[PDB]
Design a protein around this ligand. Sequence first.
Ligand SMILES: Nc1ncnc2c1ncn2[C@@H]1O[C@H](COP(=O)(O)OP(=O)(O)O)[C@@H](O)[C@H]1O
Ligand SMILES: [Mg+2]
Ligand SMILES: [Zn+2]
Ligand SMILES: [Zn+2]
Lengths: 96, 617, 48
Amino acid sequence: SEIHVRISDFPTIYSLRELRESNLSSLVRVTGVVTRRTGVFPQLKYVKFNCLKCGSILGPFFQDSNEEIRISFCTNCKSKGPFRVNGEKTVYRNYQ
Amino acid sequence: DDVTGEKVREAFEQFLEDFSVQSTDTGEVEKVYRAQIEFMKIYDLNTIYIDYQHLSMRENGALAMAISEQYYRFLPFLQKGLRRVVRKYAPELLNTSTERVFQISFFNLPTVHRIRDIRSEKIGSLLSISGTVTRTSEVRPELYKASFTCDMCRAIVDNVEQSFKYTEPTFCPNPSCENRAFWTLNVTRSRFLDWQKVRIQENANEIPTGSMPRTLDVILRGDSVERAKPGDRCKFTGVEIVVPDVTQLGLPGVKPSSTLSLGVRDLTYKISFLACHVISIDQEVFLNSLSSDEINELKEMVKDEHIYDKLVRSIAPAVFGHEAVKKGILLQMLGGVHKSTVEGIKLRGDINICVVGDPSTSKSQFLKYVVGFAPRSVYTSGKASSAAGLTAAVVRDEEGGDYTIEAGALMLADNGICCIDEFDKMDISDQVAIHEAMEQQTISIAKAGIHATLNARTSILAAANPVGGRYNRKLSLRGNLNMTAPIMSRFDLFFVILDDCNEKIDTELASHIVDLHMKRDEAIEPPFSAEQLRRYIKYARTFKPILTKEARSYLVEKYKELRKDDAQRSSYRITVRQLESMIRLSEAIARANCVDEITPSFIAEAYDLLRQSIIRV
Amino acid sequence: IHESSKFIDQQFLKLQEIPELVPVGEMPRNLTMTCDRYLTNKVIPGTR
Ligand SMILES: Nc1ncnc2c1ncn2[C@@H]1O[C@H](COP(=O)(O)OP(=O)(O)O)[C@@H](O)[C@H]1O
Ligand SMILES: [Mg+2]
Ligand SMILES: [Zn+2]
Ligand SMILES: [Zn+2]
């Protein structure tokens, strides 16, 4: 469904303790030794919220990776109750 | 508004603008502050060094008194004044290229108050505190200026600066909102300040009689973060600030409270310190740092005919009668060249000495002399110490909170000498622990959700009495010790100290001791003072001696003789570890003579030390 | 109304990767499982 681009050979290399804050929202190239893995966890990618007041499920809304979007109002029927997720129709992504 | 704050701010602006003083005999009258403004502009720095005496001389010290006594209120006024000064003179560096958060780091204050001397009246004032760095935190971003997105009348609005408590904008980009429901931050537009919380202990010398070392938590912001070292004595300058405390609710005594519908907030606090200026209390770098007076002292010191003996006699002034031990301690202090192989092996480059001797033979005196003299050194006793002490430990961040790494004794002695007094009495489990680190110089912790790999390149100086408290004439050194033969093999030098009923030495040592009690100073005068020794050791450490091709042969036949002489029964059997040790001592000797090439004299000295250290049964 | 209801058995097993085939430096990774009705009490712990 989607494609990704993997940048390589960035000029500047910073150690972990030298990140400070100027490198915020910036591309960095750091090196280290891996310590802990958290396994492979599915993460919501194309979540389809359902509207039980409408009758059926709503459209697939792209889930921003910063935070979990919510259906406060249904733009169609103004439903405050149903904003749940159906794990069958939802398309997930890997996460570690 | 406040008239006094604005008046003091403009007075500060004027004083900075017209600051004048004679500069030495050269540079005439230099507006040091105004010129240093562009000096720091050259690198576009973020600190402005306000020496206290400058602020103190003017207005009969009234400005300095106002700033020190009520710093917290005046600081934003001083920030605005500094911005106006930049606007009037040197406006080229104001923009970050929003605006650089310039740091006013005061220093050269009159007195430094101890942790125990912290008082509740002086909060909000400026002072200096001196303590030992024990625990440091990560460089976590701190929210200083934030961008807020209004849930209602949605948009993006920046420049909503963050206060000590959370703050959100009451006015909206579309004014019809005037609602503050879900003002949302964003990563790309908010502004952050580097932050670090460092825990400091009270210094050992200033500890009150019969009391524990009181601790303190110090906040570091801006360019002053990540400056302190665990176990490094440092001084902190800044303002005392209070932070909320949720622990002291069950303590006796009434509690501060408010009423506003209860409208009540439980008000408790604990005192912390926000700091601005913190300082620590290639051979070209060390040479550059060296002043010429010392550089030339060093030049005649370096070109001395007999520098080895004069260095030996200059170490351990208090102890009399032990010369080989002094040589070994000097070599350990200097160290060796850390060499890494292509296949991954990291050749050991520090000297570890285990000193065994009869009771009352200045062994504890040697260890106490080394610490407080060798930079980055830690003294411990055998029984009152544990693996969590010697090696790194795990403890909670804050009480009732997540755990974190605790600085162990070995790491506090990294690239330094660690003195382990009474090694034999120390427990066998901790013995396995210390030796395990000694083998690989790396101590790893894998408990409570932390798997950090912590390295410790530490030279270990071990002292231990023979079993039974008295050396057995019949038994060997290994027979009079409780450690294993592999432990002997790991250690480099064994200086078995013995006590003998020699009248001349008894008389001379009695004279020496009663004179040392007689003359509080000048009882014995070493040729070189502490400063000269420290510097020489520092300079010698920078050089890296290289083995000449010719000396390799002499090493080979010397190791042949060493292998032949024993078991032709001695304290330690002859092994290859010994041949490594021969270089390990040779590099230290070459550093001592301030040479760069290994000569057969150095191998002769090292073999002399190893043949004297080994003791016939 | 509990006297007129009907219920079914449910059991939670846990599955761990076989310790023989584990990467040397890594902890084993486990998985939570459910179970219902006639599949309950079908395996004792320690059974591949
Ligand atoms: N060669 C010596 N030189 C100077 N002082 C000595 C010497 N031998 C013993 N002493 C003195 O006698 C005391 C011995 O203490 P010490 O030997 O360090 O204890 P320990 O034997 O348990 O290590 C010290 O005050 C020390 O100064
Ligand atoms: Mg002792
Ligand atoms: Zn709906
Ligand atoms: Zn709004």
